[model samples]
Target: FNMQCQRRFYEALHDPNLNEEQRNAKIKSIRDDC
Candidate 1:
């Protein structure tokens, strides 16, 4: 789960399509899972 979370975190960082909302969501996702 944590590995996947880190993977997603990096993916989010690399994703230029992300808006502030999506960025925050990604952070929440990482925080919630860990």
Candidate 2:
């Protein structure tokens, strides 16, 4: 499960289209899930 989460986070970190605010929220969401 954590591996999958890490993979998803990898995808998130590499994505180019996200604006800063949106990305911060996305990262924060990932943090909360972890």
Candidate 3:
């Protein structure tokens, strides 16, 4: 579950269309929950 979430977080971070804030929020949420 952690790995899956981490993978998703990285995927979001790498997405060109996603802003840094968006990617950071996603990663922060994932970290908070995990």
Candidate 4:
């Protein structure tokens, strides 16, 4: 579960198409789920 979450966090962190605000929100949401 943690590995999946970490992968998701990094994916969002480095996603070229996502802006800072979107990335933060996505990463935050992923963390909340984990």
Top candidate when judged by TM-score against the true structure: 4
Residues 1-34 of candidate 2: C-alpha lDDT, one tens digit per residue = 4897898788787877997888878888997888
Off by over 4 Å in 1: none
What ranges in model 3 sit over 4 Å off? none
- Tell me which residue pairs clash in candidate 4: none
Task: Give each prediction's root-mean-square deviation over alpha carbons.
Answer: 2.2, 1.7, 2.0, 1.5
Predicted candidate 1 versus true structure: per-residue lDDT over 1-34, tens digit per residue: 5787778888887886888898889878777877
lDDT of 4 by residue, 1-34 (tens): 5788878988888896988888888988998889
Best-first order by TM-score: 4, 2, 3, 1
- Write down the TM-score of every candidate: 0.53, 0.70, 0.56, 0.79
Residue 13: error of model 1 in Å?
0.7
Q: How does candidate 3 fare on TM-score? A: 0.56
Name the top lDDT candidate.
4
- Native-referenced Cα lDDT, model 4: 0.84
Q: What are the lDDT scores of the predictions, listed in order?
A: 0.80, 0.82, 0.78, 0.84
1 versus 3: better TM-score goes to: 3
* Greater-lDDT candidate between 1 and 4: 4
Write the residue-wise lDDT of candidate 3 on 1-34 in tens digits. Answer: 5788878777877886867788788778877877
Candidate 2 vs 3: which has more TM-score: 2
Residue 26 deviation, candidate 1, in Å? 2.4
